[PDB]
């Protein structure tokens with residue numbers, strides 16, 4: 001659970017906090033996926049962390065003009081987009097995030 005499943009640089013923006021909409025502010029983030037949370041740093045203490053238990057993950061093609069976007073909405077209501085210009089690495093992230101989120105459903 002504390003172990004790192006994936007880490008890498010992605011572009012990210014918050015879009016809601018506790019169910020309230022936020023102005024986007026896209027920027028690069030060093031992103032760390034553990035066995036139960038996604039952790040954001042300015043570079044390789046976290047700026048922020050979210051628990052992924054019960055998170056809703058989807059494609060975010062409808063939520064941005066950017067290419068290769070994922071949308072995550074957490075149980076407390078925080079919502080984020082992740083994006084990369086590199087479609088294969090974005091797909092790798094999508095699969096890793098799916099794996100961790102689904103794992104929290106059964107364990």
Ligand SMILES: O=P(O)(O)O[C@@H]1[C@H](O)[C@H](O)[C@@H](OP(=O)(O)O)[C@H](OP(=O)(O)O)[C@H]1O
Pocket residue numbers: 023024063064065066
């Ligand atoms: O800075 P502002 O004036 O608030 O303008 C937003 C800005 O251009 C964001 O880049 C854009 O999101 P994308 O780059 O992800 O397309 C967003 O679109 P949206 O409101 O349709 O999310 C605009 O509202």
